[PDB]
DNA sequence: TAAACCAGACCGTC
């Protein structure tokens, strides 16, 4: 009636519907001394926390930055990530009490959780050294006080960008003595947003440089294929990296599981989400803690609520958790203490437990679905793993072509390394907005570098535009407006719509958060919103003004609606027309229609009533890239050609960020088989981005070099026919690269 | 697919 891990381990590896299984070898701590030279406070500090010997990859951080080489450390999960840093600031400053840091933290959560560690190590040491957070949330008044009493600041690049740099001034005592500054998830900072943060980081050299003090860059990434890159591309500053970790590792046993078939002629498998409720359920029903990822929100709640009603018998109510982003703050910090000091057994989430807060190691892992990436699936493994017993990590794919295909072929995914991060610093658009902030901060100097090499051509250019003024050779603000408020960081940014849940007009609180794009689908006027297992109606939503007014009613059924997305070219402005196909550079609007919600029963699964959503079909104006095919009376089959589109367009969508070096996310690949305006098949490339910022206009002037890049990924790519990393494994004729080629040959 | 962030200081009225 009790089993234990191995046991359930030894259960799982016979006779079941696992397809792979892959056993990474355990290993041994791999070490150095604490170097003696550490100030004998902090040695004991460190021995009180279980740390009197170093690891290898701590040890090498700790030299490396004492000599004054930046470094790039890939620690993995309970690696002693943050001591890599830890150690080298509280030495310095218990050395000189005037030195200072920065600390740059993509969330103010994370902030402020580093602060809280430090505070204890601070108050284990006993040397009156402050450590604050400076983020948005940091009450005006308080912020005087940190400006010029905290040795350690904590901010966001976000608020670097928007209050630290601008006011230096304020931050004088700050500058001058900087001699280290963290970056704590090098990774986060890709794409676009990486873009604007290594303008921002280069502002933060201008200022550093200066004020008198030239620091020395610590920073923590995930595993991208391209860690030492993207790190000396983001910092400007010589990386060396910190790969061998020597941390204690575990057997660790990486499972891929394939549910049952339940209509062969039909070829439906059962669902991932009820095979995952019952292993989840042998697992936690012996009291093994688990982390089971989902791929959505819904999911993650409705996998919440299938594992707590099977597994309430015996375990009990209050230890299986839920986690996503929208949960209050309170919530996601409690959950996040629970599944740390061990009084949380389960806990089912959204990929919002990839990034690297502190929820301690899991026992089992299990995956409902492929996450989508081998970065985002390795991430989520490396969230189970005891020191020094054993873990396991189940992922049991779904009915997706792309997960069949990781089952089909296991290997594909165990030889293919994680993926690579690109920014493009040298965005006109990103350049120019923090050229501005930065001249506003000082006056730049024409034949000073900014980044890469001289830019005084855009100086030129500002200078004609009445923001900046030359005097002799340097370039003032000459504005009285204030730039870097107007600019977001991240301007894929939004307004979220408040979950307010007026019961009693008595107590009326807010419960919740939710994007405004989500809350279309999530949180529309006869809506249900699950939080952890609690039921609300959405009594009414107020677009207009992000809110959502919402009771707590107890009904048997849950809410989902789709939303149906158009596309409509506004007007051409560029094109270049070919022998067989034409190539336009224009404006475009992307449309979301909200159109009916279904209900369906919880426990069954089945639909029993739909319903209306009166909401605006939402667009977004953006700027696209697009070739139309040109077609003769000797034409393809209407529906072969659209599964040729979709290869075409997951080729592109392969290439495009590999060339104009953005993320995947920052630019769309969609098909149309009769666009609306000419009737002929289209592939259209957006960048996502309100404004659009310049994605999809290079996509048309480089277009010919992505073409045949792409003929040339599509050739050397090692699968038969098709895999997830070039044409998608989804056309229905043999020989389907050979299709494919020859439609890249006709646009080429 | 989910998720994330944003002057310092003064002013005029409660
Ligand atoms: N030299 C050491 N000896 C013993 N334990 C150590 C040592 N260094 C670090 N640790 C342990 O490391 C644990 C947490 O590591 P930490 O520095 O927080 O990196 P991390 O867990 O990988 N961060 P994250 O990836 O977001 O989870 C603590 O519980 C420490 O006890
Ligand atoms: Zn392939």
Redesign the pocket.
């Given at each position: 009636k009790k089993k234990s891990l191995t046991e359930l381990i030894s259960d799982l590896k016979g006779n079941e519907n696992v397809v792979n299984w892959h056993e990474i070898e355990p290993r041994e701590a791999k070490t150095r001394p604490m170097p003696e030279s550490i100030d004998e406070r902090i040695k004991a500090a460190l021995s009180k926390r279980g740390i009197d010997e170093l690891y290898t990859h701590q040890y090498s951080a700790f030299q490396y930055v004492q000599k004054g080489e930046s470094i790039v450390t890939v620690t993995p999960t309970a690696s002693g990530k943050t001591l890599c840093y830890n150690l080298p600031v509280l030495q310095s400053i218990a050395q000189d009490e005037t030195n200072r840091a920065l600390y740059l933290f993509?969330?103010?959560?994370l902030?402020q959780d580093q602060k809280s560690e430090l505070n204890e190590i601070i108050d284990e040491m006993g040397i009156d050294i402050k450590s604050f957070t400076?983020?948005?949330?940091?009450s005006?008044a308080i912020?005087?006080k940190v400006?010029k009493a905290g040795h350690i600041v904590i901010?966001?690049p976000?608020?670097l960008?928007?209050?630290?740099l601008?006011?230096h001034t304020?931050w004088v005592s700050l500058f001058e003595n900087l001699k280290y500054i963290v970056i704590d998830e090098l990774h986060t900072y890709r794409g676009v947003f990486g873009s604007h943060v290594a303008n921002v980081i280069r502002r933060l050299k201008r200022i550093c440089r200066f004020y008198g003090s030239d620091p020395v860059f610590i920073c923590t990434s995930a595993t991208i294929a391209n860690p030492k890159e993207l790190g000396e591309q983001l910092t400007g500053k010589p990386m060396r990296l910190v790969d061998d970790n020597g941390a204690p590792s575990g057997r660790k046993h990486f499972v891929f599981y394939n549910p049952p078939i339940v209509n062969k002629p039909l070829n439906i498998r059962r669902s991932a989400t009820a095979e995952v409720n019952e292993l989840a359920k042998e697992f936690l029903k012996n009291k093994v803690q688990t982390i089971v990822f989902a791929?959505?929100?819904?999911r993650?709640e409705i996998i919440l609520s299938h594992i707590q009603e099977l597994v309430k018998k015996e375990i009990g109510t209050k230890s299986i958790r839920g986690?996503?982003?929208?949960y209050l703050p309170k919530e996601?910090r409690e959950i996040e203490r629970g599944l740390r000091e061990g009084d949380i057994l389960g806990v089912v989430?959204?990929?919002?437990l990839e990034?690297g807060v502190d929820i301690g190691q899991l026992q089992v892992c299990v995956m409902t679905g492929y996450?989508?990436?081998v970065a985002?699936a390795w991430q989520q493994a490396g969230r189970a793993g005891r020191r020094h017993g054993e873990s396991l990590i189940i992922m049991v794919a779904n009915s997706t072509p792309i997960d069949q295909y990781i089952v089909r072929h296991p290997e594909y995914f165990f030889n293919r390394s994680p993926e690579s991060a690109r920014i493009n610093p040298e965005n006109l658009i990103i350049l120019v907005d923090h050229l501005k902030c930065a001249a506003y901060e000082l006056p730049f100097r024409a034949d000073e570098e900014f980044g890469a090499m001289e830019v005084s051509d855009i100086l030129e250019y500002l200078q004609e535009e009445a923001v900046l003024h030359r005097n002799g050779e340097r370039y003032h603000w000459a504005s009285e407006?204030?730039p870097?408020?107007n600019?977001?960081?991240?301007?894929?940014?939004?307004?979220?719509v408040v979950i307010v849940d007026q019961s009693d007009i008595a107590n009326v609180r807010i419960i919740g958060e939710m994007?405004r794009?989500?809350a279309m689908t999530l949180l529309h006027d006869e809506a249900i919103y699950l939080h952890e297992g609690v039921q609300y109606q959405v009594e009414k939503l107020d677009w207009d003004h992000k809110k959502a007014y919402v009771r707590k009613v107890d009904v048997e059924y849950y809410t989902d609606a789709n939303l149906a997305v158009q596309l409509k070219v506004l007007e051409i402005d560029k094109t270049k027309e070919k022998s067989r196909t034409s190539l336009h550079y224009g404006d475009v609007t992307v449309n979301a229609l909200p159109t009916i919600f279904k209900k369906i029963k919880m426990t069954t699964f089945e639909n029993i009533g739909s319903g209306p959503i009166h909401l605006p079909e939402e667009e977004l104006h953006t700027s696209a890239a697009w070739l139309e095919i040109k077609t003769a009376d000797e034409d393809i089959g209407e529906k072969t050609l659209e599964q040729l589109l979709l290869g075409i367009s997951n080729v592109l969508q392969h290439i495009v960020p590999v060339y104009i070096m953005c993320d995947?996310?920052d630019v769309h690949v969609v098909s149309q088989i009769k666009a609306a305006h000419t009737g002929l098949p289209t592939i259209f490339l957006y960048d996502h981005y309100p404004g659009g910022i310049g994605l999809a206009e290079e996509v048309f002037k480089r277009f010919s070099d992505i073409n045949e890049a792409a003929k040339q990924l599509i050739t050397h790519c090692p699968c038969h026919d098709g895999c997830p990393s070039c044409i998608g494994t989804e056309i229905e004729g043999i020989k389907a690269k050979e299709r494919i080629l020859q439609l890249l040959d006709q646009m080429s």
């Open positions: 993509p969330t103010k959560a902030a400076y983020d948005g949330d940091t005006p912020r005087q400006r901010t966001n976000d608020m960008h928007s209050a630290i601008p006011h304020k791929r959505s929100r819904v993650v986690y996503r982003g929208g996601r989430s959204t990929n919002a990034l996450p989508g990436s985002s407006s204030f870097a408020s600019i977001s960081l991240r301007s894929a940014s939004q307004e979220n994007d794009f989500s995947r996310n």
